[PDB]
Write a structure and sequence with these properties.
homodimer, alpha+beta, Helix Hairpins, BirA Bifunctional Protein, domain 2, 2 domains, 8-stranded mixed sheet, 12 helices, 18 strands, about 20% strand, elongated, binds 5'-O-(N-(L-seryl)-sulfamoyl)adenosine, binds magnesium ion, tRNA-bd_arm (chains A, B), aminoacyl-trna synthetase (chains A, B), Serine--tRNA ligase (chains A, B)
Chain lengths: ~425, ~425
Amino acid sequence: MLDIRLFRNEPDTVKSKIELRGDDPKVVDEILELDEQRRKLISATEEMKARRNKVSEEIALKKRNKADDVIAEMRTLGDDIKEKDSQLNEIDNKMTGILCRIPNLISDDVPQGESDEDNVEVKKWGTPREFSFEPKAHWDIVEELKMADFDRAAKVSGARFVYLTNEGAQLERALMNYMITKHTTQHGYTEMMVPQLVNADTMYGTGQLPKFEEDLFKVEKEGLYTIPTAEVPLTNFYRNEIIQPGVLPEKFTGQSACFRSEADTRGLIRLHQFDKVEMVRFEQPEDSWNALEEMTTNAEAILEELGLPYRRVILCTGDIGFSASKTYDLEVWLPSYNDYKEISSCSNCTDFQARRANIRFKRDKAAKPELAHTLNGSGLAVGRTFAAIVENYQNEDGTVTIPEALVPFMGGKTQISKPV
Amino acid sequence: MLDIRLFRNEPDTVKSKIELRGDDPKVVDEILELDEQRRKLISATEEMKARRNKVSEEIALKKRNKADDVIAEMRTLGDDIKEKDSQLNEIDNKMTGILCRIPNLISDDVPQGESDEDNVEVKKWGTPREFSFEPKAHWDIVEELKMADFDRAAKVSGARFVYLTNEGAQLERALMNYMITKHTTQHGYTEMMVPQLVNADTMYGTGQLPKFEEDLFKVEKEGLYTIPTAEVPLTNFYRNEIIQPGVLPEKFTGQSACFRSEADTRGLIRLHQFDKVEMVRFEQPEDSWNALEEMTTNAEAILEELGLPYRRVILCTGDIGFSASKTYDLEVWLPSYNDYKEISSCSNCTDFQARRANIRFKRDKAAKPELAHTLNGSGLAVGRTFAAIVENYQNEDGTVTIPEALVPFMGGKTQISKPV
Ligand SMILES: Nc1ncnc2c1ncn2[C@@H]1O[C@H](COS(=O)(=O)NC(=O)[C@@H](N)CO)[C@@H](O)[C@H]1O
Ligand SMILES: Nc1ncnc2c1ncn2[C@@H]1O[C@H](COS(=O)(=O)NC(=O)[C@@H](N)CO)[C@@H](O)[C@H]1O
Ligand SMILES: [Mg+2]
Ligand SMILES: [Mg+2]
């Protein structure tokens, strides 16, 4: 949810930032037109309330002095104010309807672009493996090693679901334990487990509603939605609340299953359900930009310790998502793709979700409440890490060497071997 | 789904087993009435097909000898057979509709009873803690120690959801890792991770549909339901399939979030979403009774190693669930309840779900396919274990001592202390 004051005070800047995203800047003129109508309605109600005060004083003065016309005028004024109050509620809801549909205003350093080809590479770590044999794609390895089953999951849930089996399920679990342990013991995040079903206010809070309802699984009877990411319940933990002095920064981490209706046919890259270890931060506004850097680094630490070559990019104006003001994506080397593939999205949402969800804070007991800033980042999407591991750690015999940091999380196992 | 042959061959036994559950045995008479109508329809179609053969031979004989009446009779016979075929499809669907709604036939050793008071205690292990101070209930301890948050979860998901926080989330994770490690490394189960959203055929497969649809969260657009237990996708792994020779017994274990609409106001005992480490077995019919015993023992091993006093009961006829032929429940000592509280349900479903889901097997390559037996058991419901741990391991200062076997799963921590 955008600040109406920016439309009033810097409309050209707002038009520029909307246009840069590939969106229609004319919405700024539509908003200001409604704002002027709203301003006139309020101003006219105030002249009516003042007129009513004069009328009521006259009725009281005539009651003491010893209306019929001042009684009739009082009735008309009462009627007109009631009408103006309903008209104002309507214009407000109309303005809110438009405003909640506008993406977060991009930060100044977001580079201009039209597609993911215009995303700016800011860093590369590690060198893609140079194989002595033809590398197998992760979908073939997981079937050969009986780590995952797609066909049987299609039977029970339809396309783009999977069963993780034996060492496949063990590796998924080991990745989540490793990722959480890293973020909690080394990066100062507090572990959290969240509800996977949330109401519409929560989905609105983080920006998935109203625009992205069709990307979600909806439970119509109870009014719930499956979460597309732990970001949704993690950020909404402080919805409609004033965070207390001395609490910020609040750093949360945790795993959750993630559900996306998805309104990449082979494999783990795009499923309706996947696991992700999420990072969520609540920051003071002057701390959010450093927090984005620290958070992106926290996600890179997983790739680095897992020995997975990657690149960090800044999403261009045409590619950045709805709630972010600035996003870095981490893209992992995927031999089957012969390119880097997105494994994380780290964003600073500024005050966008905080305004939507009414997440405020106070610096001291006397301080005026302020909107917090919120950030979210994948640390990491588990299935895409699992995919990167099996492709990059595959052996010539078709086995998969367990990355060193995951060996103590795999009960001391060092290799994923072929079925007995 | 029951075997129609038992209604034909032992109707009194079927009536007796239905009546013992508190159900109406008159359904056996309704089924046999439809079966007789069905038998007459088939028999009459067969006399018609035989008559048609005589008629067609006559038409061919008249065509060679040198229809109009045998042509007209042939048309009538064709019409009548088509009518009888639609009538048979209808009676079959009507019979299937009734049959799929009848619970599994109880085994002979299920004791007669009307409620959970008639469940027969078969064993007790450990002695309930004798406190030197008034024990706090788990809902107060989790709030005091900041291990769980109910109020904030009500904000995002409504009543009976929870956020597990800090050491609370760490303990939930440690319980799942410990439980899975135990079942896979000591009890011979294969680790599995499953889709949490399944279609209607899968929900029918394990018996939740059609009778218990209102206990589930339904995603109407995609035709999916959230799983109430990993039993649903785990048992359905082999739906519409013939398990190969030498494969049985198939033993699966895994955690999943579990979702129940629940059509115990304070705490972790009854939530819409909870975690559970499930055990599922596919057995040859002559192995399922021993498998129930072994599986119940596997669940008890968690309680025993965690130092949690419990009792094992056999559910009485009036208390046993829909798909089970025989169930043992494990009930853990809960100081706040001043009694044992169900923490696991271990069941032998015999061929009930296998018939519903068409789960078959072959003993050798030439063998005739047979229905497998399926079993499912909690090892354990995680939230109820978490609740039992905080109440039974609580200290006088309000801290919670970490049970010995969970210390290496808690990063070496030995106590859950009060907030810093
Ligand atoms: N359908 C999907 N299947 C599997 N993984 C996915 C899917 N969609 C996204 N991901 C992974 O999940 C990551 C995070 O998803 S995101 O929409 O980009 N961003 C978020 O969800 C933020 N909350 C940060 O995690 C992506 O970077 C990608 O690696
Ligand atoms: N609403 C709930 N909230 C929390 N725990 C629950 C809830 N319902 C059941 N449980 C726990 O989950 C266990 C298994 O649930 S069950 O319906 O009895 N049986 C099954 O689900 C079988 N698949 C065996 O696990 C119960 O024994 C109980 O300890
Ligand atoms: Mg993305
Ligand atoms: Mg039960």
